[PDB]
Amino acid sequence: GSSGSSGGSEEEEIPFRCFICRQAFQNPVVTKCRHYFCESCALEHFRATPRCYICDQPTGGIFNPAKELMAKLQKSGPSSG
Ligand SMILES: [Zn+2]
Ligand SMILES: [Zn+2]
């Protein structure tokens, strides 16, 4: 018996927790490579390696607030304060 299918609600290849520490995303920031990293991991890692930890790309000390990403996760959803 060689059969096994998978599915879901909507194609969402979005992570749930950090990968550098494998812990709950704490103040994750979105980069040009469309990736997220703990405000601490991004800074710490950046120090040693100026590139990414997953795509190992030239970030150039760039980091954007992925606050919107976290919001979606929460039950509420959108962030309209
Ligand atoms: Zn981390
Ligand atoms: Zn990356």
PDB file of N, CA and C and ligand atoms in Angstrom:
ATOM      1  N   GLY A   1       0.806  -1.206   0.000  1.00  0.00           N
ATOM      2  CA  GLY A   1       0.000   0.000   0.000  1.00  0.00           C
ATOM      3  C   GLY A   1       0.842   1.260   0.000  1.00  0.00           C
ATOM      4  N   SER A   2       1.083   1.809  -1.186  1.00  0.00           N
ATOM      5  CA  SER A   2       1.884   3.020  -1.319  1.00  0.00           C
ATOM      6  C   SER A   2       1.027   4.190  -1.792  1.00  0.00           C
ATOM      7  N   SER A   3       0.356   4.844  -0.850  1.00  0.00           N
ATOM      8  CA  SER A   3      -0.502   5.978  -1.169  1.00  0.00           C
ATOM      9  C   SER A   3      -0.618   6.924   0.023  1.00  0.00           C
ATOM     10  N   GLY A   4      -0.550   8.223  -0.252  1.00  0.00           N
ATOM     11  CA  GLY A   4      -0.649   9.212   0.807  1.00  0.00           C
ATOM     12  C   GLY A   4      -0.779  10.624   0.272  1.00  0.00           C
ATOM     13  N   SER A   5      -1.970  11.198   0.406  1.00  0.00           N
ATOM     14  CA  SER A   5      -2.223  12.552  -0.074  1.00  0.00           C
ATOM     15  C   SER A   5      -2.320  13.532   1.092  1.00  0.00           C
ATOM     16  N   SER A   6      -2.168  14.818   0.789  1.00  0.00           N
ATOM     17  CA  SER A   6      -2.234  15.856   1.811  1.00  0.00           C
ATOM     18  C   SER A   6      -2.906  17.112   1.267  1.00  0.00           C
ATOM     19  N   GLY A   7      -3.510  17.889   2.161  1.00  0.00           N
ATOM     20  CA  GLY A   7      -4.182  19.109   1.753  1.00  0.00           C
ATOM     21  C   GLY A   7      -4.475  20.028   2.922  1.00  0.00           C
ATOM     22  N   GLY A   8      -5.120  21.156   2.639  1.00  0.00           N
ATOM     23  CA  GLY A   8      -5.448  22.106   3.686  1.00  0.00           C
ATOM     24  C   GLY A   8      -6.485  23.120   3.244  1.00  0.00           C
ATOM     25  N   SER A   9      -6.567  24.233   3.967  1.00  0.00           N
ATOM     26  CA  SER A   9      -7.529  25.282   3.647  1.00  0.00           C
ATOM     27  C   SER A   9      -7.020  26.156   2.505  1.00  0.00           C
ATOM     28  N   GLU A  10      -5.810  26.683   2.667  1.00  0.00           N
ATOM     29  CA  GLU A  10      -5.208  27.538   1.649  1.00  0.00           C
ATOM     30  C   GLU A  10      -3.687  27.424   1.672  1.00  0.00           C
ATOM     31  N   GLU A  11      -3.087  27.348   0.488  1.00  0.00           N
ATOM     32  CA  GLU A  11      -1.638  27.234   0.373  1.00  0.00           C
ATOM     33  C   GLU A  11      -0.940  28.328   1.177  1.00  0.00           C
ATOM     34  N   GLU A  12      -0.421  27.957   2.344  1.00  0.00           N
ATOM     35  CA  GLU A  12       0.270  28.908   3.207  1.00  0.00           C
ATOM     36  C   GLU A  12       1.598  28.335   3.692  1.00  0.00           C
ATOM     37  N   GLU A  13       2.655  28.572   2.921  1.00  0.00           N
ATOM     38  CA  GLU A  13       3.982  28.078   3.272  1.00  0.00           C
ATOM     39  C   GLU A  13       4.659  29.004   4.278  1.00  0.00           C
ATOM     40  N   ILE A  14       3.881  29.494   5.238  1.00  0.00           N
ATOM     41  CA  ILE A  14       4.405  30.390   6.261  1.00  0.00           C
ATOM     42  C   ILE A  14       4.789  29.621   7.521  1.00  0.00           C
ATOM     43  N   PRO A  15       5.974  29.934   8.067  1.00  0.00           N
ATOM     44  CA  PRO A  15       6.482  29.286   9.280  1.00  0.00           C
ATOM     45  C   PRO A  15       5.693  29.682  10.523  1.00  0.00           C
ATOM     46  N   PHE A  16       5.830  28.890  11.581  1.00  0.00           N
ATOM     47  CA  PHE A  16       5.128  29.158  12.832  1.00  0.00           C
ATOM     48  C   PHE A  16       6.107  29.588  13.922  1.00  0.00           C
ATOM     49  N   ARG A  17       7.293  28.989  13.913  1.00  0.00           N
ATOM     50  CA  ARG A  17       8.317  29.309  14.901  1.00  0.00           C
ATOM     51  C   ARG A  17       9.668  29.537  14.229  1.00  0.00           C
ATOM     52  N   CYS A  18      10.594  30.141  14.966  1.00  0.00           N
ATOM     53  CA  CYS A  18      11.926  30.419  14.443  1.00  0.00           C
ATOM     54  C   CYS A  18      12.642  29.127  14.061  1.00  0.00           C
ATOM     55  N   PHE A  19      13.672  29.250  13.230  1.00  0.00           N
ATOM     56  CA  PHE A  19      14.439  28.093  12.787  1.00  0.00           C
ATOM     57  C   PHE A  19      15.857  28.131  13.350  1.00  0.00           C
ATOM     58  N   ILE A  20      16.356  29.338  13.595  1.00  0.00           N
ATOM     59  CA  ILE A  20      17.699  29.513  14.134  1.00  0.00           C
ATOM     60  C   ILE A  20      17.788  28.999  15.567  1.00  0.00           C
ATOM     61  N   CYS A  21      16.707  29.171  16.319  1.00  0.00           N
ATOM     62  CA  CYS A  21      16.659  28.723  17.706  1.00  0.00           C
ATOM     63  C   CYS A  21      15.571  27.672  17.902  1.00  0.00           C
ATOM     64  N   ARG A  22      14.685  27.554  16.918  1.00  0.00           N
ATOM     65  CA  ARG A  22      13.595  26.588  16.982  1.00  0.00           C
ATOM     66  C   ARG A  22      12.638  26.924  18.121  1.00  0.00           C
ATOM     67  N   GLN A  23      12.446  28.216  18.366  1.00  0.00           N
ATOM     68  CA  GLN A  23      11.556  28.669  19.428  1.00  0.00           C
ATOM     69  C   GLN A  23      10.466  29.579  18.873  1.00  0.00           C
ATOM     70  N   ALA A  24       9.532  29.969  19.735  1.00  0.00           N
ATOM     71  CA  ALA A  24       8.436  30.841  19.331  1.00  0.00           C
ATOM     72  C   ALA A  24       8.962  32.151  18.751  1.00  0.00           C
ATOM     73  N   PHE A  25       8.487  32.498  17.560  1.00  0.00           N
ATOM     74  CA  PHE A  25       8.909  33.726  16.897  1.00  0.00           C
ATOM     75  C   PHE A  25       8.765  34.925  17.829  1.00  0.00           C
ATOM     76  N   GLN A  26       9.897  35.487  18.239  1.00  0.00           N
ATOM     77  CA  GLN A  26       9.897  36.640  19.133  1.00  0.00           C
ATOM     78  C   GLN A  26      10.360  37.896  18.402  1.00  0.00           C
ATOM     79  N   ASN A  27       9.406  38.744  18.031  1.00  0.00           N
ATOM     80  CA  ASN A  27       9.716  39.982  17.324  1.00  0.00           C
ATOM     81  C   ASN A  27      10.395  39.690  15.989  1.00  0.00           C
ATOM     82  N   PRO A  28       9.762  38.828  15.180  1.00  0.00           N
ATOM     83  CA  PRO A  28      10.286  38.447  13.864  1.00  0.00           C
ATOM     84  C   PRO A  28      10.218  39.592  12.860  1.00  0.00           C
ATOM     85  N   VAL A  29      11.237  39.689  12.011  1.00  0.00           N
ATOM     86  CA  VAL A  29      11.292  40.739  11.000  1.00  0.00           C
ATOM     87  C   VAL A  29      11.364  40.148   9.597  1.00  0.00           C
ATOM     88  N   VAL A  30      10.632  40.752   8.667  1.00  0.00           N
ATOM     89  CA  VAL A  30      10.613  40.287   7.285  1.00  0.00           C
ATOM     90  C   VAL A  30      11.730  40.932   6.474  1.00  0.00           C
ATOM     91  N   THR A  31      12.442  40.114   5.703  1.00  0.00           N
ATOM     92  CA  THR A  31      13.539  40.603   4.878  1.00  0.00           C
ATOM     93  C   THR A  31      13.173  40.565   3.398  1.00  0.00           C
ATOM     94  N   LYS A  32      14.090  41.027   2.555  1.00  0.00           N
ATOM     95  CA  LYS A  32      13.866  41.044   1.115  1.00  0.00           C
ATOM     96  C   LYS A  32      13.692  39.629   0.574  1.00  0.00           C
ATOM     97  N   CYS A  33      14.292  38.661   1.260  1.00  0.00           N
ATOM     98  CA  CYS A  33      14.202  37.265   0.849  1.00  0.00           C
ATOM     99  C   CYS A  33      12.890  36.643   1.318  1.00  0.00           C
ATOM    100  N   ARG A  34      11.967  37.488   1.766  1.00  0.00           N
ATOM    101  CA  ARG A  34      10.671  37.022   2.244  1.00  0.00           C
ATOM    102  C   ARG A  34      10.840  35.999   3.362  1.00  0.00           C
ATOM    103  N   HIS A  35      11.706  36.314   4.319  1.00  0.00           N
ATOM    104  CA  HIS A  35      11.960  35.421   5.446  1.00  0.00           C
ATOM    105  C   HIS A  35      11.812  36.163   6.771  1.00  0.00           C
ATOM    106  N   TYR A  36      11.609  35.410   7.845  1.00  0.00           N
ATOM    107  CA  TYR A  36      11.449  35.996   9.170  1.00  0.00           C
ATOM    108  C   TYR A  36      12.483  35.434  10.143  1.00  0.00           C
ATOM    109  N   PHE A  37      12.905  36.264  11.091  1.00  0.00           N
ATOM    110  CA  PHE A  37      13.891  35.852  12.083  1.00  0.00           C
ATOM    111  C   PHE A  37      13.757  36.679  13.360  1.00  0.00           C
ATOM    112  N   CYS A  38      13.925  36.022  14.502  1.00  0.00           N
ATOM    113  CA  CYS A  38      13.822  36.693  15.792  1.00  0.00           C
ATOM    114  C   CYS A  38      14.685  37.951  15.822  1.00  0.00           C
ATOM    115  N   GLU A  39      14.082  39.068  16.215  1.00  0.00           N
ATOM    116  CA  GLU A  39      14.795  40.337  16.287  1.00  0.00           C
ATOM    117  C   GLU A  39      16.209  40.137  16.828  1.00  0.00           C
ATOM    118  N   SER A  40      16.367  39.147  17.701  1.00  0.00           N
ATOM    119  CA  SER A  40      17.666  38.853  18.296  1.00  0.00           C
ATOM    120  C   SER A  40      18.509  37.992  17.361  1.00  0.00           C
ATOM    121  N   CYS A  41      17.879  36.988  16.760  1.00  0.00           N
ATOM    122  CA  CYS A  41      18.570  36.090  15.844  1.00  0.00           C
ATOM    123  C   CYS A  41      19.073  36.846  14.617  1.00  0.00           C
ATOM    124  N   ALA A  42      18.226  37.716  14.077  1.00  0.00           N
ATOM    125  CA  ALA A  42      18.585  38.503  12.904  1.00  0.00           C
ATOM    126  C   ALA A  42      19.795  39.386  13.186  1.00  0.00           C
ATOM    127  N   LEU A  43      19.786  40.044  14.340  1.00  0.00           N
ATOM    128  CA  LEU A  43      20.884  40.923  14.729  1.00  0.00           C
ATOM    129  C   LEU A  43      22.136  40.116  15.059  1.00  0.00           C
ATOM    130  N   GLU A  44      21.980  39.120  15.926  1.00  0.00           N
ATOM    131  CA  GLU A  44      23.098  38.273  16.325  1.00  0.00           C
ATOM    132  C   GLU A  44      23.745  37.617  15.108  1.00  0.00           C
ATOM    133  N   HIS A  45      22.928  36.942  14.304  1.00  0.00           N
ATOM    134  CA  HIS A  45      23.420  36.269  13.107  1.00  0.00           C
ATOM    135  C   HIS A  45      24.099  37.259  12.166  1.00  0.00           C
ATOM    136  N   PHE A  46      23.459  38.405  11.959  1.00  0.00           N
ATOM    137  CA  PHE A  46      24.000  39.437  11.081  1.00  0.00           C
ATOM    138  C   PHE A  46      25.441  39.768  11.455  1.00  0.00           C
ATOM    139  N   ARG A  47      25.702  39.860  12.755  1.00  0.00           N
ATOM    140  CA  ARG A  47      27.038  40.174  13.246  1.00  0.00           C
ATOM    141  C   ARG A  47      28.069  39.207  12.671  1.00  0.00           C
ATOM    142  N   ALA A  48      27.863  37.917  12.912  1.00  0.00           N
ATOM    143  CA  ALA A  48      28.773  36.892  12.417  1.00  0.00           C
ATOM    144  C   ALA A  48      28.735  36.812  10.895  1.00  0.00           C
ATOM    145  N   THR A  49      27.542  36.607  10.347  1.00  0.00           N
ATOM    146  CA  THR A  49      27.369  36.509   8.903  1.00  0.00           C
ATOM    147  C   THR A  49      26.416  37.582   8.389  1.00  0.00           C
ATOM    148  N   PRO A  50      26.910  38.419   7.463  1.00  0.00           N
ATOM    149  CA  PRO A  50      26.117  39.501   6.872  1.00  0.00           C
ATOM    150  C   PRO A  50      25.016  38.979   5.955  1.00  0.00           C
ATOM    151  N   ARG A  51      24.987  37.664   5.764  1.00  0.00           N
ATOM    152  CA  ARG A  51      23.984  37.039   4.909  1.00  0.00           C
ATOM    153  C   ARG A  51      22.879  36.401   5.745  1.00  0.00           C
ATOM    154  N   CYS A  52      21.903  35.803   5.068  1.00  0.00           N
ATOM    155  CA  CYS A  52      20.787  35.155   5.746  1.00  0.00           C
ATOM    156  C   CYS A  52      21.216  33.819   6.346  1.00  0.00           C
ATOM    157  N   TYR A  53      20.352  33.244   7.175  1.00  0.00           N
ATOM    158  CA  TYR A  53      20.642  31.967   7.815  1.00  0.00           C
ATOM    159  C   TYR A  53      19.979  30.817   7.064  1.00  0.00           C
ATOM    160  N   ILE A  54      19.026  31.154   6.202  1.00  0.00           N
ATOM    161  CA  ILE A  54      18.315  30.151   5.418  1.00  0.00           C
ATOM    162  C   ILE A  54      18.707  30.225   3.946  1.00  0.00           C
ATOM    163  N   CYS A  55      18.558  31.408   3.359  1.00  0.00           N
ATOM    164  CA  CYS A  55      18.896  31.613   1.955  1.00  0.00           C
ATOM    165  C   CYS A  55      20.327  32.124   1.811  1.00  0.00           C
ATOM    166  N   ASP A  56      20.946  32.461   2.937  1.00  0.00           N
ATOM    167  CA  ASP A  56      22.316  32.961   2.936  1.00  0.00           C
ATOM    168  C   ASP A  56      22.510  34.011   1.846  1.00  0.00           C
ATOM    169  N   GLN A  57      21.612  34.991   1.809  1.00  0.00           N
ATOM    170  CA  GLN A  57      21.685  36.055   0.815  1.00  0.00           C
ATOM    171  C   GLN A  57      22.197  37.349   1.439  1.00  0.00           C
ATOM    172  N   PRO A  58      22.736  38.240   0.594  1.00  0.00           N
ATOM    173  CA  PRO A  58      23.271  39.530   1.041  1.00  0.00           C
ATOM    174  C   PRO A  58      22.175  40.484   1.503  1.00  0.00           C
ATOM    175  N   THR A  59      21.776  40.354   2.764  1.00  0.00           N
ATOM    176  CA  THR A  59      20.735  41.203   3.329  1.00  0.00           C
ATOM    177  C   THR A  59      21.168  42.664   3.347  1.00  0.00           C
ATOM    178  N   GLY A  60      22.447  42.895   3.628  1.00  0.00           N
ATOM    179  CA  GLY A  60      22.965  44.249   3.671  1.00  0.00           C
ATOM    180  C   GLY A  60      22.466  45.023   4.874  1.00  0.00           C
ATOM    181  N   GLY A  61      22.319  44.333   6.001  1.00  0.00           N
ATOM    182  CA  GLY A  61      21.845  44.978   7.211  1.00  0.00           C
ATOM    183  C   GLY A  61      20.451  45.551   7.054  1.00  0.00           C
ATOM    184  N   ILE A  62      19.601  44.843   6.320  1.00  0.00           N
ATOM    185  CA  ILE A  62      18.231  45.288   6.094  1.00  0.00           C
ATOM    186  C   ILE A  62      17.232  44.372   6.795  1.00  0.00           C
ATOM    187  N   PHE A  63      16.235  44.973   7.433  1.00  0.00           N
ATOM    188  CA  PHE A  63      15.212  44.212   8.142  1.00  0.00           C
ATOM    189  C   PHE A  63      13.929  45.026   8.285  1.00  0.00           C
ATOM    190  N   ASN A  64      12.809  44.427   7.894  1.00  0.00           N
ATOM    191  CA  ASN A  64      11.516  45.096   7.976  1.00  0.00           C
ATOM    192  C   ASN A  64      10.625  44.430   9.022  1.00  0.00           C
ATOM    193  N   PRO A  65       9.801  45.243   9.700  1.00  0.00           N
ATOM    194  CA  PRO A  65       8.884  44.756  10.734  1.00  0.00           C
ATOM    195  C   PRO A  65       7.745  43.923  10.155  1.00  0.00           C
ATOM    196  N   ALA A  66       7.774  42.622  10.420  1.00  0.00           N
ATOM    197  CA  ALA A  66       6.744  41.717   9.927  1.00  0.00           C
ATOM    198  C   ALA A  66       5.580  41.625  10.907  1.00  0.00           C
ATOM    199  N   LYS A  67       5.256  42.746  11.541  1.00  0.00           N
ATOM    200  CA  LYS A  67       4.162  42.793  12.504  1.00  0.00           C
ATOM    201  C   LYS A  67       2.878  42.234  11.898  1.00  0.00           C
ATOM    202  N   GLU A  68       2.657  42.528  10.620  1.00  0.00           N
ATOM    203  CA  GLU A  68       1.466  42.054   9.923  1.00  0.00           C
ATOM    204  C   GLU A  68       1.413  40.529   9.914  1.00  0.00           C
ATOM    205  N   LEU A  69       2.571  39.903   9.733  1.00  0.00           N
ATOM    206  CA  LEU A  69       2.657  38.448   9.703  1.00  0.00           C
ATOM    207  C   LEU A  69       2.179  37.847  11.021  1.00  0.00           C
ATOM    208  N   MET A  70       2.652  38.408  12.128  1.00  0.00           N
ATOM    209  CA  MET A  70       2.269  37.929  13.451  1.00  0.00           C
ATOM    210  C   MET A  70       0.770  38.099  13.677  1.00  0.00           C
ATOM    211  N   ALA A  71       0.244  39.256  13.291  1.00  0.00           N
ATOM    212  CA  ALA A  71      -1.176  39.542  13.451  1.00  0.00           C
ATOM    213  C   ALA A  71      -2.030  38.403  12.903  1.00  0.00           C
ATOM    214  N   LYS A  72      -1.836  38.085  11.628  1.00  0.00           N
ATOM    215  CA  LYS A  72      -2.587  37.015  10.982  1.00  0.00           C
ATOM    216  C   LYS A  72      -2.660  35.784  11.880  1.00  0.00           C
ATOM    217  N   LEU A  73      -1.514  35.379  12.416  1.00  0.00           N
ATOM    218  CA  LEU A  73      -1.449  34.216  13.293  1.00  0.00           C
ATOM    219  C   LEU A  73      -2.498  34.308  14.397  1.00  0.00           C
ATOM    220  N   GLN A  74      -2.480  35.415  15.131  1.00  0.00           N
ATOM    221  CA  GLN A  74      -3.431  35.626  16.217  1.00  0.00           C
ATOM    222  C   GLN A  74      -4.854  35.322  15.761  1.00  0.00           C
ATOM    223  N   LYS A  75      -5.736  35.062  16.722  1.00  0.00           N
ATOM    224  CA  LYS A  75      -7.129  34.756  16.420  1.00  0.00           C
ATOM    225  C   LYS A  75      -7.796  35.920  15.693  1.00  0.00           C
ATOM    226  N   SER A  76      -7.647  37.120  16.245  1.00  0.00           N
ATOM    227  CA  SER A  76      -8.238  38.313  15.649  1.00  0.00           C
ATOM    228  C   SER A  76      -8.047  38.315  14.136  1.00  0.00           C
ATOM    229  N   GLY A  77      -6.808  38.522  13.701  1.00  0.00           N
ATOM    230  CA  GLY A  77      -6.513  38.545  12.280  1.00  0.00           C
ATOM    231  C   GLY A  77      -5.811  39.818  11.854  1.00  0.00           C
ATOM    232  N   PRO A  78      -6.575  40.751  11.265  1.00  0.00           N
ATOM    233  CA  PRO A  78      -6.038  42.033  10.797  1.00  0.00           C
ATOM    234  C   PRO A  78      -5.637  42.948  11.950  1.00  0.00           C
ATOM    235  N   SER A  79      -4.797  43.933  11.651  1.00  0.00           N
ATOM    236  CA  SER A  79      -4.333  44.876  12.663  1.00  0.00           C
ATOM    237  C   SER A  79      -4.717  46.305  12.291  1.00  0.00           C
ATOM    238  N   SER A  80      -5.898  46.727  12.731  1.00  0.00           N
ATOM    239  CA  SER A  80      -6.386  48.070  12.442  1.00  0.00           C
ATOM    240  C   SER A  80      -6.676  48.832  13.731  1.00  0.00           C
ATOM    241  N   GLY A  81      -5.626  49.379  14.337  1.00  0.00           N
ATOM    242  CA  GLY A  81      -5.789  50.126  15.571  1.00  0.00           C
ATOM    243  C   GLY A  81      -6.233  51.555  15.329  1.00  0.00           C
TER     244      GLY A  81
HETATM  245 ZN    ZN B   1      15.316  32.692  16.779  1.00  0.00          ZN
HETATM  246 ZN    ZN B   2      16.538  34.628   3.810  1.00  0.00          ZN
END
